[PDB]
Amino acid sequence: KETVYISSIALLKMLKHGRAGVPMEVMGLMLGEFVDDYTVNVVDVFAMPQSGTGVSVEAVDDVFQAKMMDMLKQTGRDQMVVGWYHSHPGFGCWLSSVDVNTQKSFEQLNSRAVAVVVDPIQSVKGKVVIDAFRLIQALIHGLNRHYYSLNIDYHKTAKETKMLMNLHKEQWQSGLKMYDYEEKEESNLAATKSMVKIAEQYSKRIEEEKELTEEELKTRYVGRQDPKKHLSETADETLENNIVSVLTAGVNSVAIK
């Protein structure tokens, strides 16, 4: 039920610094605000210099930190330090015990402070691997034992999005574009489960409608819609969406190869 909302600039600065430090792990701090018990919002990030030793407690640099703080004050960015990013390149997202102790050093600052692990290399143009969570593949380290996972979402202002739109100009390329497949897996599934759901509704309307007059039936059902029209209706989206879905791939395979 608990969650964090990670603004775009945070996420991009994140992945940038991470990808830039490869193949060594980088750390930094997270600026935001705690809405309620159920939420942490992260609007900002700044990057913490390298250390001779690995990412660790003293890697956090007071001088550097406050030195950044005030200079953000002058920009009005004033926020708490709500968590700290990090990266475990190639190793997936989990906290080593050494990650843990530091996480505690951020518990005693604020009890709700969170840990964010980013994984630059295997995060790729598909799904981005990211994780945020706090203490008490990954189960080897006691995913649930010493600590526990959290959830993540992304705040987007209208204008933000509007900038992001113009990145790709798809106006020429449309029609060879194949939309995300997993999404049409939930599509082609939930659609079918639904058709099942209204099947026996159409069954009940044919039996009841059989033994009861139309004038009586209307009184009952006018509230909802004619389950025969959810068959007639719902069959379509599956039909044509799946025919363009098939054809599009049939073309990309033979044409593009």
Partner 1 sequence: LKDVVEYLDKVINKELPINHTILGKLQDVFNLLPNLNNLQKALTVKTND
* Bridge-based pairing state of the strands 27-33 and 39-48: antiparallel
CB of 54 to Zn ion, least distance (A): 8
**251, interface contact from partner 1, Zn ion, none, CB < 5-8 Å by kind:** none
Task: Indicate which single residue of 44, 99, 119, 131 sits in contact with Zn ion (rule: CB under 5 A).
Answer: 99
Q: Which is nearer to Zn ion, 86 or 230 (CB)?
A: 86
The structure tokens 């990030």 sit at 45
Give the phi and the psi of residue 2 in degrees, each rounded to 5. Answer: -80, 150
**54, interface contact from partner 1, Zn ion, none, CB < 5-8 Å by kind:** none
User: Could you tell me the sign of the dihedral formed by the alpha carbons of 6, 9, 15, 17, in that order?
Assistant: negative
With contact defined as beta carbons under 8 Å apart, do 135 and 113 qualify?
no
Q: Which is nearer to partner 1, 196 or 256 (CB)?
A: 256
Which of 9, 5, 89, 19 minimizes the C-alpha distance to 54?
Answer: 89
* Helices and strands (H, E) in the chain, number of each type: 7, 8
With contact defined as beta carbons under 8 Å apart, do 57 and 10 qualify?
no
CB of 191 to partner 1, least distance (A): 13
Q: What angle do CA 58, 47, 126 make, to 5 degrees?
A: 120
Q: Which is nearer to partner 1, 74 or 253 (CB)?
A: 253
**1, interface contact from Zn ion, partner 1, none, CB < 5-8 Å by kind:** none
Binding residues for partner 1 (CB under 8 A)? 181, 188, 246, 249-250, 253, 256-257
CB of 17 to Zn ion, least distance (A): 14
- Which residue blocks in the chain are alpha helix, DSSP H? 8-21, 62-73, 97-105, 158-165, 181-211, 214-221, 227-256
**230, interface contact from Zn ion, partner 1, none, CB < 5-8 Å by kind:** none
Binding site membership: which residues?
A: 86, 88, 99
Q: Which is nearer to partner 1, 154 or 181 (CB)?
A: 181
Give the phi and the psi of residue 32 in degrees, each rounded to 5. Answer: -175, -160
CB of 199 to partner 1, least distance (A): 21
119: contact with Zn ion by CB under 5 A: no
CB of 195 to partner 1, least distance (A): 16
Binding site membership for Zn(2+): which residues?
A: 86, 88, 99
**241, interface contact from partner 1, Zn ion, none, CB < 5-8 Å by kind:** none
Q: Which residues bind Zn ion (CB under 5 A)?
A: 88, 99
